[PDB]
Amino acid sequence: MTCRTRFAPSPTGYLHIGGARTALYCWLEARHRGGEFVLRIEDTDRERSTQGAIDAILEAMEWLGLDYDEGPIYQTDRVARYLEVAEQLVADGKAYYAYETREELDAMREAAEKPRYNGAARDLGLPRRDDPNRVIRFKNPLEGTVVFDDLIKGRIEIANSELDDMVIFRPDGYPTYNFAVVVDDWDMGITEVIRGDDHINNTPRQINLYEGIGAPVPKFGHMPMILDEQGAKLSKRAADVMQYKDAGYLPDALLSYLARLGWSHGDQELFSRQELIELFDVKDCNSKASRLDMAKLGWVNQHFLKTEDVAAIVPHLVYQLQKLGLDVAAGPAPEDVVVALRERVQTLKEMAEKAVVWYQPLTEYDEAAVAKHFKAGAEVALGKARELLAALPEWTAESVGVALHDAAAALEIGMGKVAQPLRVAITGTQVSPDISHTVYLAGREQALKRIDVAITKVA
Template sequence: MTVKTRFAPSPTGYLHIGGARTALYSWLYARKTGGSFALRIEDTDRERSIQASVDAILEGMEWLGLDYDEGPVFQTQRFDRYAEVIQQLMDEGHAYHCYCSREELEEMREQQRANKEKPRYDGRCRARTEPVEGVEPVIRFRNPLEGDVVIKDLVKGDIVINNRELDDLIIARSDGTPTYNLTVVVDDIDMGMTHVIRGDDHINNTPRQINIMKALGATVPAFAHVPMILGDDGKRLSKRHGAVGVMQYRDDGYLPEAVLNYLIRLGWSHGDQEIFSREEMLEFFELEDIHGAASAFNTEKLNWMNQQYFKSLPVEVIEGHLQWHLENQKLDISNGPALADVIEGQRERAKNLVDFVETSRYFFEDFDSYDAKAQKKQFKAGVDATLQATHDRLAALDDWNPESIQSAINATCEALELGMGKVGPPLRLAVAGTPMSPGLDVTLNLVGRERTLQRIEKAIAFIAETTA
């Protein structure tokens, strides 16, 4: 058997982090087993489905690197097929017309609640043979009345539901449009799905879908219901926890490699290992190792993981991810050092890609002001003389490289009989405009001789003017 999995989001909003984890698990299992992975857009909710959401899903999948072998398949392009299957179920006695009005159904449920019974459709139209004039009926699936449905769940173990717990669900609305449980079944059958990996909020749908599959004579796929993601307060993840669309994580400066690594660990583990390359994910991932309990999203842990990837990814990979941020934050890097060299200099310090761009501006752009707190502390009377001495030694260098720069700074300290704490901080502020930067030798080398000397001269003039 060739494994086939799918990710089937509804385009009624962004691709959220829980959906991205489901997509990752489905993608991993297909790739690990040499199977195929499909993307299906479940867009039958025409009132809420919008193109912007479809675009966000496709963009999110591309950013995460979750490529698919089939799709995107759109359910709205398959209405003829759904109508064909609904008619088949009608013809074979597995479905029937229901003429009950909303008022009749609500009265039925109220009576059941009064009798302390589970509110459910009681099947009163099952045996109806004559239509009701002037009423457009819905179509209900004739659920079996006896026996059990067994979900052989690869994450939660066997789940047994008695058929008497299930009512006859609607598979076609009065206007003829199919409902979710019908379209999902038809698509999974037609697309040859062998494994359905999805959130455990679908468990209530699964026995109904299994019964429809059996009525159609189809092979039932294996199921793996993944627990939901909670916030750190134990409640369902939502915007109040910072849960946003996947592309917001891109916008906030996260690396897709870090997001994927965090997602796979959010409900799955392999010993005590925290960092996984994509190759290791494929090697170690097993559906049976997914935790049965819900996982809590922790932004601090994601931030830590993002920094680990910033430190370890090849420079050219980070450089590729930076392009969008450079454009978004309008930083022109044409007049400055090679971006790869700045990445090497900054990778131990940057928190994320947004932070990297903002804290790297001084390598490419001149600035008109200094960090206010650092200025007050470092640019005191007399510091201009220290900067002038440093400037003169730097200007006399034959070679401009980290080693010669550091030697010139050390020589200034010795000549002035000052510690590095008196020479280095004002020099850094003069050249970078901020008290935070890589080592002075690296910073000055990347800024370049001409810019470094000009900025020191500008700082000397500024100190002389403000302390006069």
């Protein structure tokens, strides 16, 4: 009935953006269809799945706003369930014990064709016995083909003679991936399995397992893996979601970009989170792979910086301000910084770095800037601006702008004769955003003090 999807990562230490994209599509499918999104942690490997690695997944999903209706559900919590189902398949004659050694299985290297398991023990009905090579194998169908209509890839058909009686339970007491994932997806009523297409050849093995169990078979959707700019499969050697946080990308912008990587809607290129929910259908996902494009993502991030609500951007700027060890309380309000810089930067890291000049005293002047704009005569504009700014009853970006325009009009000069030296006065450089905001963001006390210093540096 109700659509139910899952994200089932195996913890490696961080959330790969390929995994983020998979979580995103599963989340969007569930949200668009008013269903549930389940978080499962494939944590049986006790070495890889440290608590720290699990926390990295959870923290990254929280940063992206990918809330989950259910979970996290841990495979290490479900061991007796896996063994119960495995042993019931044996009792029902649909799975069996086998005992071959690795070198016996290795001796089935004999290609001449494709390697697989002999099925030797399949009808031998061997009892359970204490043995380090004991496995439980599923009786896969011997003949015919497996068919499924992949939501993304279309009709897929694999011959059963290409499959074998897969191991479903290992000598070390743990299920195999193909067994655990079916039992989990069955137990949690998953209706649409949406995952990367490097899992696609295990799908017919899983489908047969559903059918041997007597479980309804879900639909499947397999996305091509994300490639890097050169076209190779992606890895940390821009893969960590938290790296994009540290670089200053907005979560919603990363999500819009990741969605557009393997999904499309006409010629639209930019999607709010609300638009993604409204428009997403896993069936509209691209079957062809796409490359990363850091430039497109920066472009996407610029749009979100330009159009999202200021209060939505603010906490992400504050994060970057704190990284730089800045006393945010003593400097300008971060919302005012966002207003002055949101149209002029590509990331919030860049925004924070360009905002440092308002959060600390001005001590280092660009010598070339002083030489160009603090020539004799510049004190007239500076003193007139200083006088008008000091008389403002209120200190706002608008009122500062009026004082600066009044200064130019009072002296009957172009705004450049005011802005150029004032820019060096406030920042020590000839690079800043709009002069009115640049002055405003220093605050009243700092603006007057810095201009006073500037007037003493004239000639």
